[model samples]
Structures are given as C-alpha cells and as structure tokens.
Target: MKCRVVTTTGTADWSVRESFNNYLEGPIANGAAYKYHGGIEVRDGVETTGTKSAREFTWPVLGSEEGAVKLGGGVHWTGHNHYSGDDESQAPDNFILDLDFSNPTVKFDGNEGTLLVDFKSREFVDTKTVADFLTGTQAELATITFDEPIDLTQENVTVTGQTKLTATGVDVMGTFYPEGEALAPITLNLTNEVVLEHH
Candidate 1:
C-alpha cells in the first residue's frame, strides 16, 4: 500500500517505508434493539443491525510533508493560511490510500484473507499550529480469522471525519512559518472500504 496526497498545485506521492502496516478497528454490527407494548407486555424485537462505526490507519515517516518542497511543490498550507505566514491559499489537500490485496499468501491473525478497498478523503487542513492534532473521517469492513473463523458484516462504514497527530516530545528550537521541526509517531485516521472479506 501507499499514501498519496493531492493538492491544488499538484500531487505528492510516496511509497510506505519498510515498516508500514495497515491497522483496522471497529465493531461489525450494533446490538439488537427491542420494544414492549400493551398492558400485557407484548414483546417486540427489532431485527436490524448497525454497521461498522470506526476506521483508521497509521504509519511512521522520516520527515514532515510540509517541509518537503518536492512533496508540497512549495505550497504547504491548504486552507486559510493562518500560521503558514502566507495569506494566499496554497492548495486544497486530500489524502488517498492505494491498497493491493492480490497477495494470496498474506495472512492476518493467522488466517488467509483478501481485502479490496478504496479510501479517499475530503479536503483537509494541515494541523501544524499545535504540537498535536486530530483530523480525518470516521468509518471499516467485514472479515474472518482464527481456527473457528469468524464472519463479520456491516450495513455501511461511517467516517469519523478527522485524523489525529500527537507529539511525543519537544525538539531543538525551530521556526514554524516556512517550516517546522519533524514530529514522530504521527497518527493518521482513515476509512476502510465497504467490504473486507476473509476466509
């Protein structure tokens, strides 16, 4: 898999580092609901099930996307350039995840599975003001695993609408306008495709 960013000026594309691994989390479905009626206490059950509610992925990088002139094309700020020290809008940035599930030998949790997904993000701003930030969408898929293999399904995936980045420690003195010090363990919130199947 790889991460690609599309900006108003152009696009910044890069392959994942050696340690890249995709992480997925969320519930398959919601618990059943029920209702009671009449003085006799007639029991009525709702058979509907809720869909997956949370989705995200994370990876570590060596440098900041904002600092890379090649990646940003000299345009860093996306939305209202408040702290970028530039008043004009640079580019509207969006994130994309290109996933390949063609490897049949791959196993997740000791079970072979295949997942086809298309993850696209809405326009997002670079949260460089604070040392930490959370932005992105909320969202997942279905799947299987283990000896007694589990089957999971959902009506739809819901994107949380934001990604988060938390700084672990401070670095040497640096400026924030043209560029900022690199951060570590950046957290990214992402959405999984509609269906993730495992067997």
Candidate 2:
C-alpha cells in the first residue's frame, strides 16, 4: 500500500510585476498601453499608485505533491503592450512588445518554493539591429521565498510572501524588469483533503 495526496481545490492570487505597468505608461515609454486576450483579474488597472490599482492574475489550479507541493493549471495570457517609437511611420503595431505566460508551476521544498513557467516574449526592437528573440523555451519566472512553507496538513491554509523575479524573467522581459526585482506577494489558498489509494 502506498500513500498519495492529490490537491482537490485551490486558488492562487498574484499581481505580476505591477510596477512594470507603470514604467511602460510613464514618461519613458511615451504613451504605452497593454491589451490582453484571456482572463486576468485587474481590479482598478495597471497603475502602482493613484487609487491603488494592480494588475492581477487570480485563477484555480490542479496540483499534487511528491515530497514537495506543485501547483499547476496554467493561466494562459497572450497579449502585447503597444508604444510609440521614433519612426511612427512603421505603424504603431510594429512597436509591440509581445508576451505569453503559460505552463505554470508554483512548487515548494518543504516550505520555501519556486514559481516556474513556460514563458515566451518579444522585445521592442528596431529593424536595423538584431532579432527581437533568437530561440527560447522554458523561462523560470520567480524565485519565491515563502513566509509559510506551506503545511498541507492544515485546512484553508494561506501562504503569502514576496516574489523576486529570476534572471530568466528579466531576460524574457528584455531586462525591463531587473533580476531579483520585487513585484507582489504570492498568496495561495488550499483545501487540505488527502485521498489515500491502494492499488
């Protein structure tokens, strides 16, 4: 007989790099805006300040643990932020920054854990120079240090803590978000129900 525990229900709430939104819209980007294709909970909007609106991704996940917990149920979002460039002649869409976040995993080591994702992105590049992207695959999004190492034994457990972006994250963002950049806290709620199966 072997013991196995599968995650029955859970919700992960995250505001992914809220400040990046502000940076794009600020004076530097010169009138930048983001548009999305799928569901991502953005309450107020993508402003770090002024009425306190943060761009969020709150969704359900299906997970299981193998000595360590793994949260997966991808929140697939494909969108781009449009901005102005010196040569407006190429049409605004030509200056787009494309981004796609999928295949998510918020996993742990007893308590502390990491958030990995199958991320793909494109940086705003001038046609004169190198390609926007070369070849890419998996991108490690965040290196999360958990405040509560996540005790699955408890019911309705909530773990909240800061998330720092990894080198992969910064690189995917064209270094717009520096490595080890602090974005927002990661909050996960779980329904602690263990199902034991003997086969």
Candidate 3:
C-alpha cells in the first residue's frame, strides 16, 4: 500500500510593514464636541500680533474600509517642539482608537478613503501635543496598497499619519507672541516603526 506523505513546518515566520495615508481638507461638520483654542499671526508691514480664537472641533477617522487589520497594542501619538528650542522631543501620548475598520472617512481629511477630522473634536483629546506649544489640529487617512503580501509576524510594522497642529497658548502665557496671534497651523507627516512577533 502506498501512502501520501506530507510535511509541514512547525513554525512560520515573516515580516510586514503597514502604512496609512491621507490629506488635510478641513474641519469636521458635527460629531463630537470640543473647545478649540488656537490662532495665527497677521503679517502687516513687519507688524505681528496674535488673534487666538476659541472654537469647537470634531475629529473624524477612517474605519476598517482600507482592509481590516488587527492592531495589537494601543495607539500612541508622539510629538516634538521646534520653536520651543528644546533639545529632545516629548514622548507619545495615548489617543483614541476607534478600532473600526469599516469607516475610513474623517472630519479634516475628507470622505471616500480619506479620514476627515476636526482638531477641536473630542476624539483626539489625548493625542500627542508639543508641550503646550502646539496642538494636533487635523489629520488624514489613506489606503496603502502593498506590492506583495508579507507574513507580518516576522517583519517590521510601521504606522504613519499626516497630521497638522496649530500653535495655541504657550507654556508661559504672554511670553511668546504676546502682541498678536502666536499660533498657526503647522502640517507634518509622522511615521512610526515597530517589530511584530506572533506569540
């Protein structure tokens, strides 16, 4: 009698990198509530002043529409202060995680694969900030098409976000931009990398 023989590997290993993309369109219409405090400078013949405003915002997020994937740990937000003249940057802060892979639309970026968000929304209350110097105002989300499928367990994973922040009140109030608006929306693209190991 002839028997079919088959062999299988006990352990499988591989690597993968995950990336997110989006654009900053504008503020969200309605969703949550928040009290926004931010501003910009008025350039007039070498004259500068701060005109900060207190408005509300609602931050939107992209759900699992861009291919439902599992996020092992919590979402962490990191930031740095340029104008503050600090040497090192601050650590990451715990932010809200919708955990839904179906809704990819947001408030600031836009709808249709773009995650929109309002900087003044309650969704980003715990988002990373620049040491009282800057506030994460807006963000975006995009689909990441991979060239090849990876194991994800044996590869390095990366998390990216295109975010914007406005200079609101400073640590020492009335110290910087005391005359005019001392705040302006600063756009930035952040990419964080990590290694994934299946237990």
Ranked by lDDT, top first: 2, 3, 1
Clash list (residue pairs), candidate 2: 111-149
> After aligning candidate 2 to the native by TM-score, how far in Å is the CA of 64 from where it should be?
2.2
Off by over 4 Å in 1: 1-88, 93-111, 120-148, 151-199
Best by TM-score: 2
Taking the tens digit of each residue's C-alpha lDDT, what string does model 3 give over 129-176?
Answer: 222222233223222222233222322333323322113222112122
In order, the Cα lDDT scores of the candidates are 0.18, 0.56, 0.21
lDDT of 1 by residue, 39-124 (tens): 10101111111211221122211121221211111101111222322332321221111112110111123232211112221222
Error of 1 at 44 (Å): 31
Candidate 1 residue-pair clash tally: 18
- TM-score for all models, in order of appearance: 0.16, 0.68, 0.17
Candidate with better lDDT, 2 vs 3: 2
- For model 2, how does the per-residue alpha-carbon lDDT over 35-82 read when each residue is reduced to its tens digit? 212122222121122311345566465665653444443332223434
